[PDB]
């Protein structure tokens, strides 16, 4: 192939405009590697100006860039190391392992901008994955290939929820895990990324369960813009690969939508007067684009986005449930009893809740729980308010059995044996729904509360009710 | 240079507003396209990576830490600007 | 006389209503003075920089 | 019709602010600089020309009926304010009143006619 290589002209602050000769102009979404004393940087094409030169976006800062500076061109977008062993390291955007522990020995680099899938090929198939845990996978059963996120505030346990989820999949799925890192703040990014580590989930001399793809937004927009697109492919590489429905794990889409917006102003485009984003459309589509079903595998992106003090601004963060298929909040009065599942079952809604998606009795057990809590709620209104004794007897296992549910939602995790020193549980969603139902009809009434309290399964639920019969009682 | 030589250290970046609204002047005076509000898509990408600066090294660097305490001087309590 | 002391307490009270009223009622409508003021200078803004 | 027949003329104008709003649709790719809330730069003159076209001549009258669509009910809007002086009767259709069941919605204080006098 011929040595393609260009000389900059031009750099509009992250924006650097690079000359080519005639044929060898790159397309747009095209990586030009610059050699730099600093590291490696790169930029993507955005805009083509003409008379053989291209606008571009750099993926780090441009420090001490200089006309004429020799600019190499990849050939296609930007590559990026993709395979098991990008698991359990911190990997920028450009794909540079940036967690210092040596260069990433992948075999092969999937360009982040792939051709997307076809309106034929888009499945439209709802079934469910099995989590392994009951809240989630029974309240709000997550869509697979679909859209799925966590609304959780600060100090509820929503990084330790990702640990479990991740953990769960990768033990009952079987398949690996992606997180994204756009627009994190590196403070929280190393807090999580110790967690990671201290969990012992990522075993750096051993097997690792989420691929950390990891981009700091100290860095230009389009950094940002593309972390979402590089942990995209590392998904999809996942996926195509080896036969697992991985998860994808945003960590804000809002985050993601106003590097974008920037992005666009940076380009040459503009937003409308008094605040209102509608040029994500192009950006946000190819996103929810690359995250759909395919034949062999599936990538459920989880949309962690974090409450901002209940006022969503831009338009894509505003009114999230429409883009949603399972809400999972985390909100901090189920905490605040204790339930280590911040997961609230009232709030928690999914979209593919329904008789022919889930199944009938699945259908049935969700409803009539949800149902019992409704009950359980407002007649704890009247217990905290007029006293235990203004209530029917009716009403009394109404709300026996939907205490014994709630408490029944308090599940061990498999990442928090160090937390808080508790046996992780990977439960069954054939056994979630047993036991649902088991406490539902009434016939585990006579189980004591406690042992109900702090147990995954029906089988735990007898067990430690037998211990407490036979060390307390 | 506190943080990387063992010290703590502690900013405190007052009325970053106005910078913001200097670098948006710098910016419209230099032919760069204006984003919202008439400031320059950069100017998160400028308080990003003035604010990353200060941060809580590990015990390797000495345990240095930098502490970052800016003020926006909104107008109005509408912090439901861009800039805010 | 117990009726007029009843009478005047109670108007007290619905005062005292009307003036939370007025009070929260005020506060929204600054917080929506102070949005379409400033909405003035992003209008100006963006003529100024459109049309200069 | 007002001068050549000498009869009474009932012009009836129907969304004269469509004039204007073409007007600034020309002028934005005219290469004009686009006035206060991107109206037209010219708005005032052209419109004062169309206006001003239709009088009360010796020859005959013209009667024209104009209704004015104001944009978001905005009466400070350029183009409806500028009517407002270029215009002898005054009518507004206030929504206020248009959704409080008196649909004629005629507002009886904005609406005002040269005519009020004893």
Partial sequence: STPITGKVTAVIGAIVDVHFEQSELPAILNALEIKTPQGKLVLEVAQHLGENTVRTIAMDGTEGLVRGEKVLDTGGPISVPVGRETLGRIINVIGEPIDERGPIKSKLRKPIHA?????????????????????????????????????????????????????????????????????????????????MKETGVINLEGES????????MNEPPGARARVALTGLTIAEYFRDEEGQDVLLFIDNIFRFTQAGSEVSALLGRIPS???????????????????????????????????????LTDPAPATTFAHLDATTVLSRGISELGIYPAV????????????????????????????TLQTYKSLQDIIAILGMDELSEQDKLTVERARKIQRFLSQPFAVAEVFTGIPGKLVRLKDT?????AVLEG???????????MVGGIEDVVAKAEKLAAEAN | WFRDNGKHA????????????????????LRRPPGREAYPGDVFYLHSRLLERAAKLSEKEGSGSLTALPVIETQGGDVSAYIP | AQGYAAEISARRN???????????????????????????????????????
Avoid at chain 1, 344 to 371: C, F, M
């Fill in chain 1, 115 to 195: 051709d997307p899938p076809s309106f034929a090929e888009q499945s439209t198939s709802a079934e469910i994955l099995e989590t392994g845990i009951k809240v989630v996978d029974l309240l709000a059963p997550y869509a697979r290939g679909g859209k799925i996120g966590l609304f959780g505030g600060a100090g509820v346990g929503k990084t330790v929820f990702i640990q479990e989820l991740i953990n769960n999949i990768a033990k009952a799925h079987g398949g690996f895990s992606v997180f994204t890192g756009v627009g994190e703040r590196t403070r929280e990014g190393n807090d999580l990324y110790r967690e």
């Fill in chain 1, 209 to 216: 369960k989420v691929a950390l793809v990891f981009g700091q």
């Fill in chain 1, 273 to 311: 007067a008094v605040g209102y984003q509608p040029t994500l459309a192009t950006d946000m589509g190819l996103l929810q684009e690359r995250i759909t079903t395919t034949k062999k595998g599936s990538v459920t992106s989880v949309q962690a986005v974090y409450v901002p003090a209940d006022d």
């Fill in chain 1, 344 to 371: 609230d079952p009232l709030d928690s809604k999914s979209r593919l809740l329904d008789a022919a998606v889930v199944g009938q009795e699945h259908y049935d057990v969700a409803s009539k729980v949800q149902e």
């Fill in chain 1, 433 to 437: 729904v047993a036991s649902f139902k």
């Fill in chain 1, 443 to 453: 016939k585990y009434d006579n189980i004591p509360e406690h042992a109900f309290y």
């Fill in chain 2, 10 to 29: 502690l900013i405190v970046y007052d009325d970053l507003s106005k910078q913001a609204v200097a670098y948006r002047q710098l910016s419209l005076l």
């Fill in chain 3, 14 to 52: 619905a005062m005292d209503n009307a003036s939370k009223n007025a009070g929260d009622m005020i506060n929204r409508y600054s917080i929506l003075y102070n949005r379409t003021r400033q909405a003035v200078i992003t209008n100006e803004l963006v003529d100024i920089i459109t049309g200069a």
